[PDB]
Amino acid sequence: HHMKVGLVGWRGMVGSVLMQRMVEENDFAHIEPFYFSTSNAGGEAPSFGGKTAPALMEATDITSLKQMDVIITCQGGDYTSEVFPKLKATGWDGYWIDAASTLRMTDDAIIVLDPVNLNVIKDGLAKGTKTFVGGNCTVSLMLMGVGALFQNNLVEWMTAMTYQAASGAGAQNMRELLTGMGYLYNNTKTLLDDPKSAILDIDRQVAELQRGEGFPSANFGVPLAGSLIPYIDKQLESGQSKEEWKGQVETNKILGNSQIVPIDGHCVRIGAMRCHSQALTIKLKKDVPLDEIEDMIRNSNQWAKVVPNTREASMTDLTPVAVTGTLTVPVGRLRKLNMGKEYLGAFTVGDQLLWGAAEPLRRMLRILVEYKS
Amino acid sequence: HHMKVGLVGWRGMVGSVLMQRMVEENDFAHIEPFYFSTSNAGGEAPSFGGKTAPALMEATDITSLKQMDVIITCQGGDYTSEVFPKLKATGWDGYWIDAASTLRMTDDAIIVLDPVNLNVIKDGLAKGTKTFVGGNCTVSLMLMGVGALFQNNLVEWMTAMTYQAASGAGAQNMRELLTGMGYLYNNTKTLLDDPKSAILDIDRQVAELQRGEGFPSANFGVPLAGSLIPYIDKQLESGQSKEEWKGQVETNKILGNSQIVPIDGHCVRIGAMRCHSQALTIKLKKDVPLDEIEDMIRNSNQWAKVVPNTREASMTDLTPVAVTGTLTVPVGRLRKLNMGKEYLGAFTVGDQLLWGAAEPLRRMLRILVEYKSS
């Protein structure tokens, strides 16, 4: 028997990465797919993987959703907040796989990152857990790189200073970043085209352009091109942003920690398209040799990569350009810090749309397919 | 009476900021300026501040330099390494004020950041110190913002994860950053001009552009626009970069600490023009109340500012856009971290060409002028 799988939000950015990866990995072979829509119900459905589906169904129609064995949704938090309580109220006993943060910290949900917590997932499947949620992008990308140190109970605490890409905010935010890049160059190029133009005149013009009404900043609120924004997501009473708050709660939940390992830091937006980078101060519980730390990372999963701590390798392999659109999670600059041999510095880069969004969801669907067979 | 002041490297980027600031602050009224040149000796000199000067002198000519009471040089490390030992070998007893890192850690030099270490400077002047050097941009900007915590001996250690601008690498690097921004947009705009074009198509095209031979990366060596580079300056035997190593040695030398406060972290280049930003994990020796920490920062000097830890204020005041080309040094996101009340998080932004380069040098010149008139 093939499970009836309802796909929701498959047309948006994260859902589109999910569809591309599912096709690449032959994921449609053993499911019966049904496509849902919020603006095009009744229209022609895709036939991804060569599997035809009936006309698009209404994503908010509880009676249609209830006919599915699994719902995998990339539609987002407003959708889950509206639809999930009503679907569950019917007695529907199917599986819900969600990209959105809504359900992450609910008692009945597991946050999925199976290269790190396959055991947690499989235990939950057997115990009757029905709701599985992707983690926040920054947490998942960090654990894909240095999660082995946590799994071995080596970490006393960690601070994470992030360099987050525009894709985490959305497709319109990525387009705005690029448009702003063009705005700065195209309105300065008459100066740049003269090799002897004054750099201070060029610089004055960039600043005027960034501060002016013409700069396109509708989505981020303030300029990102040529700048950074040291605040991501909602303001909490403590002064932490919600993005920073996710670090401690989601990391410890993915790991299944009952006792919290403290995680904190600043989450900062920079002008990259879709790779998040993180600069980590990791306080270890004991003096672990650096070469053993490196081997733990290498052996943790096939996507983590240790980048030698050299100028050349760091510049070519430990950047958004090296990583973007790939499943590789490099970890570099690995070094014991000046305040003691128990202090480990690390710098890691990962693709936000893959391990940070779509990839845990398709792998969870595969785990469920194999479990149900 | 006016000291004869030789200006070297005044035409370069840092020296141009110095010259503009000196004009704005009427710094030429108190000196007799002489202009030196490495490629235009004999040419007409500027008359900044309305002071005329003789024809440009040769910056490497020891006979001309030794006529000066003060040399202030923005020319750079290769120049200082060549000329400084030759000039001091003559017995020249003048003052040397230098932007370059060359002399920073020599016994006889003082690193100048007078809003933080005026006492170290005035002490050295009275002891006979003649060589005063600007500190690395990262350290100076950090101390302008949170130096009060170190001056009050509250800091047990600190890690600094930096977001450094192109200007620290040079004018050509800034131009390359902007040119790469244009390269990415102008070669993707046929897609961007369609509101329904596929974001993954746009993304694929940006990555191809960044990875292709057409991408302008001669100066940084790899792309910076749309990226970052987690390595700045030379690789040291310890695995630090030289940029990261400057953190601990320069901070403790500016402050005059006998007991070294550990400072470490990663220095990362991002696509900004001339403002460095730094995300700090500060381990305090005791639980200092957050409001007292903020007051220490606010009251430290007139350029440090505490940005309220709110989404709106952080987005508008704690960014390169808010700070660029100004002397303001905002410090924000100030909060005790989850691992304990002794752990303080902070995020600060500073202009690299002003407090990070030219401003300490012109202020040092003013200190010297005032000191030599008693």
Automatic annotation (TrEMBL), chain B:
Q: Say yes or no: keyword Amino-acid biosynthesis present.
A: yes
Q: In which pathway does it act?
A: Amino-acid biosynthesis; L-threonine biosynthesis; L-threonine from L-aspartate: step 2/5; Amino-acid biosynthesis; L-lysine biosynthesis via DAP pathway; (S)-tetrahydrodipicolinate from L-aspartate: step 2/4; Amino-acid biosynthesis; L-methionine biosynthesis via de novo pathway; L-homoserine from L-aspartate: step 2/3
- List UniProt keywords, sorted A-Z: Amino-acid biosynthesis, Diaminopimelate biosynthesis, Lysine biosynthesis, Methionine biosynthesis, NADP, Nucleotide-binding, Oxidoreductase, Threonine biosynthesis
| Annotated NADP(+) binding sites | R11, G12, M13, V14, T38, S39, Q75, S167, G168, Q352
* GO function terms (MF aspect): aspartate-semialdehyde dehydrogenase activity; NAD binding; NADP binding; protein dimerization activity
The catalysed reaction is: L-aspartate 4-semialdehyde + phosphate + NADP(+) = 4-phospho-L-aspartate + NADPH + H(+)
Q: Where does substrate bind?
A: Q164, E243, R269
**Residues noted as binding phosphate in the record, renumbered to the chain:** R104, K246
Enzyme active site: C137, H276
* Superkingdom assignment: Bacteria
The family line of this record is:
Belongs to the aspartate-semialdehyde dehydrogenase family.
PANTHER family, alphabetized:
ASPARTATE-SEMIALDEHYDE DEHYDROGENASE, DEHYDROGENASE, PUTATIVE-RELATED
Its quaternary organisation is: Homodimer.
Q: What is this protein called?
A: Aspartate-semialdehyde dehydrogenase
Q: What is the lineage of its organism?
A: Bacteria, Pseudomonadati, Pseudomonadota, Gammaproteobacteria, Moraxellales
**Gene this protein is translated from:** asd
